[PDB]
């Protein structure tokens, strides 16, 4: 209540405070507790193999230099005080681009406690790398992580833990990605060794399951409809050369445009995906349908009836094997 | 352990410290050791002729002004101390755009040693120029370098070396580019002379071998399938003018759309690539197939049978010569 008294107390705390030295410098490591509140996952990019996360990132640690007596309150201080305090040198090892939000002020909090506990909060948006296995795309499940580490302090000097254990990360229910469901999240703690020493690590990972629905509509269904279209040829008289050859060409070429378009939406991976396998199967069906007519055409100068039954049935077999293997 | 003692020692180190003067100013050059830990190569762009690298960049040098006694520890200091120290004026001569990561703090480390050795670490993402020879694209091998140099200090004042020799660069195994394999990396050291004097240089280069698989599927296979499609015409009766002319047109025009689309994904180079040679060969085959029908059409108002054998065989020869020359 007495602002001169509080001002005196805080001035005394910061008098001769050396930001260069961690709490308990030269002694046991400072334990830093970390909790995350997820605001959003804005984007997941296959082409860039990354995702964009917004979170409230909070760090908890005790600094005995900041302990104060005679005030039974937690002091919430203006965020600019953070520049006069030691804070951990935490970074995100797999981040590509990150920033602290700055409007209307730096989205930063400092709360001091009488025992010298410092609560330091930041609102961060990060684009973080996530290597994806697209062999089953778009029936794939991905593991995207956020790796949290101390940059310069080893485990001799700093230690990390998930504050609250399995409850340290909140807001996973808020994530609303149209193309993915969050199956699970996990929290891990370990030490990572480099040439410069052993460093504390915290890892947050998510299991993402792709929703098929968009892909059924966008790629699978057009391919099915083109393949069915190709079969119309077999009901046309063999003298209708222009009509039946037109059907063969248009379906074959449409399947090429669909294939090439699709792979321009994705990174230039050297392996075959699940969707590639489907499109290649569909291409073979429609190509053989045209070749069937070439064969009929070839001898006329029963086969059509045989095509009317065998082709749709074979496509059913193809689909059965495919969707069983991958679903 | 005694933080007042450590604070006193460090304050004494920085008292009267002149950041303007290099260590041993006016004396022998300061030797700066450099090690790199590669985190990722995010992107390789043919259109922009550049690549994006993320690395941990560490510099090692001795500054006798920072030597301290009576403390048998290496002092890890808050990264903000870097602003009160001399550091080398290292830059990347072939970089296009670079930044030091800034969340949650500047990804920077300072570790002092009792003898005055300074360890200075930065986490940097750089987009760096890489002129590519696309004459064999996409069967090409590229050499992309990172050129590290002192901006203003000559070899009279500063010297660079790879700290650890051939082990100075780690993490090459981490690089996971879908379109490339890292064949080799090399470390070079030399002096580079300009009008203003001789400057120390360190060069890190990689040999990148393009993976063919994506290109086989995306460009080569469609071209093969269009060329085969063109041959169907030869099994159609010569009276089927609409059917056979349709086949000729559609294949010819599809090969044009494939060509023009492809070169819109690449920079506007004035020379012919390997892929251009293939597409031009395929174009000639399908164009001649249509012209074959024009010739048949021309006289009817044996040639088809001759086309049925000679065309596929010639395409086999074309492919044999091509893939031997380039693979």
């Amino acid at each position, epitope marked *: 209540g007495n602002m001169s008294f509080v001002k005196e107390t805080v001035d005394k705390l910061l008098k001769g405070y050396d930001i260069r030295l961690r709490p308990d410098f030269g002694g046991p490591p400072v334990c830093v507790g970390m909790n995350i509140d997820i605001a959003s996952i804005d984007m997941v990019s296959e082409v860039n193999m990354d995702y964009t996360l917004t979170m409230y990132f909070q760090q908890y640690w005790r600094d005995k230099r900041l302990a104060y007596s005679g005030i039974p309150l937690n002091l919430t201080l203006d965020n600019r005080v953070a520049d006069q305090l030691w804070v951990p040198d935490t970074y995100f*090892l*797999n981040d590509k681009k990150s920033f602290v939000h700055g409007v209307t002020v730096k989205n930063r909090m400092i709360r001091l406690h009488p025992d010298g506990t410092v609560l330091y909060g930041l609102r961060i948006t990060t684009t973080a790398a996530c*290597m994806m*296995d697209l062999r089953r795309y778009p029936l794939d499940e991905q*593991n995207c*992580t956020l*790796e949290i580490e101390s940059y310069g302090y080893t485990t001799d000097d700093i230690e990390f833990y998930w504050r609250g254990g399995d409850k340290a990360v909140t807001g996973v229910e808020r994530i609303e990605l149209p193309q993915f469901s969050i199956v699970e999240h996990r929290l891990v703690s370990r*030490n*990572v*060794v*480099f*040439a410069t020493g052993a460093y504390p690590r915290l*890892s947050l990972s998510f299991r993402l399951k792709r929703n098929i629905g968009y892909f059924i509509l966008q790629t699978y269904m057009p391919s099915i409809l083109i393949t069915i279209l190709s079969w119309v040829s077999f009901w046309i008289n063999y003298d209708a050369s222009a009509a039946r050859v037109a059907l063969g060409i248009t379906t074959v070429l449409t399947m090429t445009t669909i294939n090439t378009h699709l792979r321009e939406t994705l990174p230039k991976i050297p392996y075959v995906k699940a969707i590639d396998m489907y499109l290649m199967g569909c291409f073979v069906f429609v190509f053989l349908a045209l070749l069937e007519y070439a064969f009929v055409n070839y001898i006329f100068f029963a086969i059509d009836r045989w095509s009317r039954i065998v082709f749709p049935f074979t496509f059913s077999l193809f689909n059965l094997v495919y969707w069983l293997y991958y679903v | 352990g005694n933080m007042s003692f450590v604070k006193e020692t460090v304050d004494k180190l920085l008292k009267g410290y002149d950041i303007r003067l290099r260590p041993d100013f006016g004396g022998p050059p300061v030797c700066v050791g450099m090690n790199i830990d590669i985190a990722s190569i995010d992107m390789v762009s043919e259109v922009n002729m550049d690549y994006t690298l993320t690395m941990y960049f560490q510099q090692y040098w001795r500054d006798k002004r920072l030597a301290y006694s009576g403390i048998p520890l290496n002092l890890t200091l808050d990264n903000r101390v870097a602003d009160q120290l001399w550091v080398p004026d290292t830059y990347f001569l072939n970089d296009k755009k670079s930044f030091v990561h800034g969340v949650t703090v500047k990804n920077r480390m300072i570790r002092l040693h009792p003898d005055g050795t300074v360890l200075y670490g930065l986490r940097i993402t750089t987009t760096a120029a890489c002129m590519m020879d696309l004459r064999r694209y996409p069967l090409d091998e590229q050499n992309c370098t990172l050129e590290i140099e002192s901006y203003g200090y000559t070899t009279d004042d500063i010297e660079f070396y790879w700290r650890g020799g051939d082990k100075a660069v*780690t993490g*090459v*195994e*981490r*690089i*996971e580019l879908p379109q490339f*394999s*890292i064949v080799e990396h090399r470390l070079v050291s030399r002096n580079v002379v300009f009008a203003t004097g001789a400057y120390p240089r360190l060069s890190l280069s990689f040999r990148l071998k393009r993976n063919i698989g994506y290109f086989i599927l995306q460009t080569y296979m469609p071209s093969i399938l269009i060329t085969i499609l063109s041959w169907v015409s030869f099994w159609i009766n010569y009276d089927a003018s609409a059917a056979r002319v349709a086949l000729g047109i559609t294949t010819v025009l599809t090969m044009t759309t494939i060509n023009t689309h492809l070169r819109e994904t690449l920079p506007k180079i004035p020379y012919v690539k390997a892929i251009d040679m293939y597409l031009m060969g395929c174009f000639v085959f399908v164009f001649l197939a249509l012209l074959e029908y024009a010739f048949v059409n021309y006289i009817f108002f044996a040639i088809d049978r001759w086309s049925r054998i000679v065309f596929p065989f010639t395409f086999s020869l074309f492919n044999l010569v091509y893939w031997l020359y380039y693979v």
Partner: nanobody
Amino acid sequence: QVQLVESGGGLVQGSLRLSCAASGHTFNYPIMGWFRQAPGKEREFVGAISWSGGSTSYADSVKDRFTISRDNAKNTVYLEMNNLKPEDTAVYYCAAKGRYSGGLYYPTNYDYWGQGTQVTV
């Protein structure tokens, strides 16, 4: 979740080919390492290979003697131990490293350890 079974050790006087067959979530663990533990001595780095690319690294002791490579079809890594020596007498272990799990050289960075073939010469 990775399982590693290694075989082809034994006792010889000579060229040898240790093999290391992986199964499971190998995507999350792109690096395979070879370690060896002599009786008494600490567990020691031999070499490592990326599954994708085959980017290879060796300890000095075995540089230009041993050769590692793999085949992604079988999910198998092999240590081709040529030009053997009586120093090369240890339980050779195979292990998998996570993508972000630190330096190649340090066995504590590795999660999934093979059984370990004893090799004496």
